[PDB]
Amino acid sequence: MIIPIRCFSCGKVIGDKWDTYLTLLQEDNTEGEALDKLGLQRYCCRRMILTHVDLIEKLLCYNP
Amino acid sequence: PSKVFIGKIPIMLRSTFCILNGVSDSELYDLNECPYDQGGYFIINGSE
Numbered sequence: 001m002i003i004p005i006r007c008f009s010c011g012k013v014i015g016d017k018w019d020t021y022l023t024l025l026q027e028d029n030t031e032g033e034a035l036d037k038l039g040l041q042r043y044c045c046r047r048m049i050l051t052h053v054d055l056i057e058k059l060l061c062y063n064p
Numbered sequence: 065p066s067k068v069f070i071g072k073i074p075i076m077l078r079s080t081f082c083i084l085n086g087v088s089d090s091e092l093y094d095l096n097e098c099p100y101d102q103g104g105y106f107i108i109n110g111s112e
């Protein structure tokens with residue numbers, strides 16, 4: 001459910017860096033490589049936005 | 065004839081004669097279901 005915020009290995013904040021991420025791999029014709037434009041030189045955490053599942057859009061639609 | 069009732073038969077979720085079958089994803093949620101369920105099971109006495 002939603003980006004982890006703070007990568008698992010370092011501290012590099014990733015809560016901020018997704019509302020902007022998704023607006024490239026599906027909205028700018030840049031590669032998975034495009035995240036490099038977000039200051040992701042380390043492995044590391046950058047496999048954080050990448051290996052992530054958006055499990056809330058598909059959970060939020062159960063309205064009580 | 066007579067159309068009389070003869071006991072009850074437990075249905076298997078997501079079948080040709082189930083309550084869902086041809087229901088679109090967007091409408092499975094409304095019912096508190098999960099578009100990933102693939103049926104296969106019975107819910108007799110409340111448990112799969």
Ligand SMILES: [Zn+2]
Nearest residue numbers: 007010044045
């Ligand atoms: Zn990291």
